[model samples]
Target: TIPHLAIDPFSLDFFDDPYPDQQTLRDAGPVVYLDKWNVYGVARYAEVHAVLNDPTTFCSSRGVGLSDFKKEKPWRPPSLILEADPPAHTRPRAVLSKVLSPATMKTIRDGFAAAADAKVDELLQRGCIDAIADLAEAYPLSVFPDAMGLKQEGREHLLPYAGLVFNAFGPPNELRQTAIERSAPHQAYVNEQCQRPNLAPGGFGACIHAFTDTGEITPDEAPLLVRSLLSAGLDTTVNGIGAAVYCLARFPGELQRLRSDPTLARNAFEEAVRFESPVQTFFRTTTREVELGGAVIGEGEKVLMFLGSANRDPRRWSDPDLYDITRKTSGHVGFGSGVHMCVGQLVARLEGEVMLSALARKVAAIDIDGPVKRRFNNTLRGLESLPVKLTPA
Candidate 1:
């Protein structure tokens, strides 16, 4: 029998401070049944990695959310990549993999770095700023849309749409409901932008459409592939960059280490990801009855893998709670694992590296200047406001 706990992981209370509850869930066992959501949760690093690695046994086609796509109507068109299983997941993943490969990232690297430097210069002009709004959100919004060839007019919709998409991964609670209401227009705009005619020439959106010509994916599937970029690209990077800034601010020693050795910027960004996973939780449904940790979970049962918890699991790391930039963050599930792992991670890392590197070069120290506000979402962990005072290098 599986251990049962009456915990609502989606409740506002849980979202506010999830670490204590994460420890409880992990301590419960490898797998615990949450009575509130009636879902199975795998909190330990080993089990979470196991579930993520074996996506065939733990399928995503049923929908990686509380509302099964086969059973309930999806709030929006399902992600062709994120919520798909093998054969169906294969082509889209390949297409995106090539599109966001290191070579492709290299082409954009100098441009992205320039933008980061420019953004940091802008920040340097103002000693105190909201790192979340001024740096994190601003940096991505400045570059990503243009990279996708999106019009600047309504570009503000990107974050809200992403927030809604991520929140819908949880139950149809008030948070999800509010996101649904607020994001309708933004969603419509995103869908419109995915269309090839609306995209800019030589941009990622155009590259996705190019795959249709290669017979890799269908003309119908092309826009959704662009939709995949729109969905996964912005918010993750925004929150990730925010997480790095927040982590560095809290651990000024880490900031000092980063400043001393600027090359550690990428490692700092990755360590921040390990420290505070931006895309915290994702679900994978069991394909059939499977035994895990000496317990059997029924076929079609929803299994929530807490990526954030797994990254911080004491069993996986020595002093897992400490945010050390020098730590080897290679195996961290921050970008996820297996075939369904994050395709846009290279681009995310590039964005983080450039921005943090620029900050390390220009800023001597970062200190929290005011109250930090947490932005609560069903799946993403980030800040709504992170006020910081930066001293010149």
Candidate 2:
């Protein structure tokens, strides 16, 4: 019989902190039948990697949460990128890969670097501030909208839209329901902002619309693709930055390493992604009956892959729990693995590297000033607020 776990992974208790229960899921078995939600879970590195890598055997089209798209209606249209399987996913993926390519990053590097430095200057002036507000949220909200061509007036809607989108990926618990009720206006505003008329000329949104001119995608498809960018790009980076700052605040030696060698800034962020996986888990549906970890799971079954647990699986990492900036994190599922790997990874990396580098350049130490509040969402994990005093270097 498959091992059964009755844990409510979506509970606020788990969101407040996840690793201990994740450890329970990981140690339970390779494949667990979570009676609490009638889904299976894979917490180890091998199986999680396999599940993500082989999307055909374990598909995402059914929905990446407790609810199956085939059985129930989605709160909104499915993501052009995050929720679609290939061939449906291929063209949109290509369009975004081109939009967020290394060349694009190279072009935007100076702007991001300058913004990071300027943002750091503002934070140092505050003396003590919430890192999540002044840095993490502020930084992405500042730079990404400019890059995406979104106008400033309704930008307040961005985070709320993202919050709802991410929270929607879990069961329709209080968290998801509350976000839905509160975020309807935010969602509508984001949808309107995705249109071509609202996009600034020469920005990423304009670029996505430009593809429509080349007949790569339809005029109608352009906004949806832009919505895809708006849906994920900022929130993920915001949390990535927050996760890195939190890691450095908790581990002084790692900050020392960055202070000594600023070039490791990128790796430091990547390591933090590994250390505290921002997108903790995703559910995939089985296409056909398959045997995993000595258990045969049937077709159409929902299987959750714990990206955070897989990153910390001791079997795959040396001191898996330790936040070491020098460690190689190439295969980690923090940004996820396989074809569905995060679309805006380059943008996140650019933001993460520059932000951390600027912080290392200015701050000698990062210390907690008060309670570090956790912003709990159904799927995304990160700080709600991090009040910290940065000692000027």
What is the C-alpha local distance difference test score of each model? Answer: 0.90, 0.91
User: Per-residue lDDT for 169-251 in model 1, tens only?
Assistant: 98878899888888879878988998989988888999889988879888899998899898889999999999999988889
TM-score quality measure for candidate 2: 0.98
When superposed on Cα atoms, how far off is each prediction in RMSD? 1.0, 0.9
Q: What tens-digit string does per-residue lDDT give for candidate 2 at 57-142?
A: 88888888778999999888888777789889899999999999999999999999999999998888878989998889999998
- In candidate 2, the residue pairs with backbone N, CA or C atoms under 3 Å apart (3 or more residues apart, or in different chains) clash, namely none
Residue runs of model 1 more than 4 Å from their true location after superposition: none
For candidate 1, what's the RMSD?
Answer: 1.0
The C-alpha TM-scores of every prediction are 0.98, 0.98
